[PDB]
Amino acid sequence: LGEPEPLTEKALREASSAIDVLGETLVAEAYCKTWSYREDALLALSKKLMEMPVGTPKEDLKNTLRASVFLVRRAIKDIVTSVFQASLKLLKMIITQYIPKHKLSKLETAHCVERTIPVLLTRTGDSSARLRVTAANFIQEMALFKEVKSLQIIPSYLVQPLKANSSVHLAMSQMGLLARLLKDLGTGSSGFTIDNVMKFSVSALEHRVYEVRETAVRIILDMYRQHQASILEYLPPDDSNTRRNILYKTIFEGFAKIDG
């Protein structure tokens, strides 16, 4: 049980503000090469956050939240599973317990979500299937927490178009999350719209990976079962020249199958 190594010059400037709020010891623990210290820092921070009394000044509560979110964000990228899992436990406590306990605003909730969800989505492209599932399940869990659901933030990340050079795992995970949360949250108040969903799905039909294109077809057909006529403007016209692309054939005779 030797002490954590010192922070590098780069880490020092990067974590400058967190050091003032949380102290150098805890930040050094979080940055060091010993996973059990990285884990302990997050669990210690978890204890510290919930022991802060109700009447604590709002600016101290917000600073502490912002410094903690800074550490959660880096720990979501951890190379050891236990540290990754401890960061999710901390993140959940901040959004679901700390914020409502101290009656903090929607801007704080939004800050937690905006700083962590994009980094968490990168972990849904991990090589480990068990890690992809843990990351995806947590995103689904946060998307349905009452305070986060109201902000409509998470659906907006899930409809962002798939990059050309995107991995097979990353693309499949995003599509899986889109389909599952679209069914749970629906259209209107959620942040999903016929507009952004179809825009995403039609764009995915040009992806290099067969399985990505195939899932886009499945989502388009599901949107036709629900919304019928209002999605047709997003697609090309139904005729035999369009049907010389094999995917659009499947879609349009798919539409024909769904009707009489």
CA 259, CA 225: separation in Å to the nearest integer? Answer: 9
Q: Token pair of 233, please?
A: 């403007």
> Is there a contact between 71 and 30 (Cβ–Cβ < 8 Å)?
yes
CA gap 12, 28 in Å, rounded: 9
Upper half-sphere CA count for residue 188 (Cβ side, 13 Å): 5
Alpha carbon distance 198, 230 (integer Å): 11
- What's the rounded Cα separation, in Å, for the pair 91 and 68? 9
Resolution (A): 2.2
Beta strands in 58-178 (DSSP E): none
- The residue among 195, 224, 219 whose CA lies nearest residue 207 is 219
153 close to 192: Cβ distance less than 8 angstroms: no
- List, as one string, the DSSP characters of 157-223: HHTSPPPTT--HHHHHHHHHHHHHHHHHH-SSSSS--HHHHHHHHHHHTT-SSHHHHHHHHHHHHHH
Q: Let me know how long the chain is.
A: 260
Phi, psi of 140 (to 5 degrees): -60, -40
CA–CA distance from 168 to each of 110, 156, 175, 201, 206 (Å)? 29, 21, 11, 16, 14
> Max alpha carbon distance in the chain (Å)?
74
CA distance 206 to 213: 7
Residues 96, 101, 106, 109, CA torsion sign: negative
Query: Residue 229 region, left (φ>0) first, then alpha (ψ -120 to 50), else beta?
Result: alpha
Q: Which residue has the tokens 């507009």?
A: 195
Question: How many domains, the chain?
Answer: 1
CA–CA dist 136, 212 (Å, integer) = 17
Whole-angstrom Cα distance, residue 84 to residue 22?
20
Residue 46 · residue 90 · CB < 8 Å: yes
The C-alpha atoms of residue 105 and residue 70 are separated, in whole angstroms, by 18
Elucidated via: X-ray
Is the Cβ–Cβ distance between 169 and 124 less than 8 Å? yes
Assess contact for 147 and 106: CB atoms under 8 A.
yes
CB 191, CB 153: distance < 8 Å: yes
6-13's contacts with Cβ under 8 Å and 24+ in sequence apart are 7/31
Domain that holds residue 226: 1-260
- Calculate the CA dihedral of residues 210, 216, 220, 225 and round it to 10 degrees: 90
Q: Which residue has the tokens 């709020």?
A: 21
Helix (H) or strand (E) holding 40: helix 35-51
Q: Which of 192, 190, 78, 104 has the alpha carbon at shortest distance from 144? A: 190
The helix-helix angle for 106-122 and 168-185 (nearest 10°) equals: 140
Please give the Cα distance from 240 to 227 (Å, whole number): 24
